[PDB]
Amino acid sequence: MGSSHHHHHHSSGHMFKYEDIPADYRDLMPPEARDFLQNLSDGDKTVLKEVFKAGPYKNTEESIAALKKKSPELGAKVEKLHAMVKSKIAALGPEAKGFAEKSIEIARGIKARYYTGNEPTKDDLKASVKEVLKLYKAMSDAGKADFGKQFPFLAKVFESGKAAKFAGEN
């Protein structure tokens, strides 16, 4: 008698799959930030949530550090990825930089709560891009265009309104 006569698996079955994310929204994220969850598999995904649910991190480098401790290579995998991103945001002006290191915080948070097991509903993602538009619409034109140099892929979908049709137009 016992739980053996009940369902099996409860805390070892749920696993984030990048293929299960609303593809409309995966279109709204940079290809570089996709390559990672293209290549990243179950075993490593498992440890992301350990870093996330522990925290807290005033910066992503703390998470990179935590990842280097828990999964050495994985920390390097996220490092190189985030480093490139930083290199571009480094080339970004104050206005667009403020948007970058805040909109990505939203976008990353979505696929970060995918890691944790707190999978967002379809309407949660709307909220995500909604604020990036709330910010991006409010930026000065020159700053909006300058964001298109450091992150052309995102500027693309923002100008075309692809993200707009996702948020419900800001």
Could you give the CA distance from residue 33 to residue 21 in angstroms, rounded to a whole number?
14
Could you give the CA distance from residue 165 to residue 170 in angstroms, rounded to a whole number?
9
Tally Cβ neighbours within 10 Å of residue 67. Answer: 23
Please say whether the beta carbons of 67 and 112 come within 8 A.
no
Q: Concatenate the DSSP letters of all residues of the chain into one string.
A: --GGGS---SSSS----GGGS-HHHHTTS-THHHHHHHH--HHHHHHHHHHHHH---SSHHHHHHHHHHHSHHHHHHHHHHHHHHHHHHHTS-HHHHHHHHHHHHHHHHHHHTTTTT-PPPHHHHHHHHHHHHHHHTTS-HHHHHHHHHH-HHHHHHHHHTTTHHHHT--
Q: Residue 59 contacts by C-beta under 8 Å, 6 or more apart in sequence?
A: none
Instruction: State residue 39 phi and psi, 5-degree precision.
Output: -90, -25
- Tell me the domain boundaries of the chain: 1-170
The amino acid present at 58, given as its one-letter code, is K
Taken in order 56, 110, 133, 83, the sign of the CA dihedral is positive
Q: Is the bond into 56 cis (omega within 30 degrees of 0)? A: yes
Taken in order 105, 111, 113, 118, the sign of the CA dihedral is positive
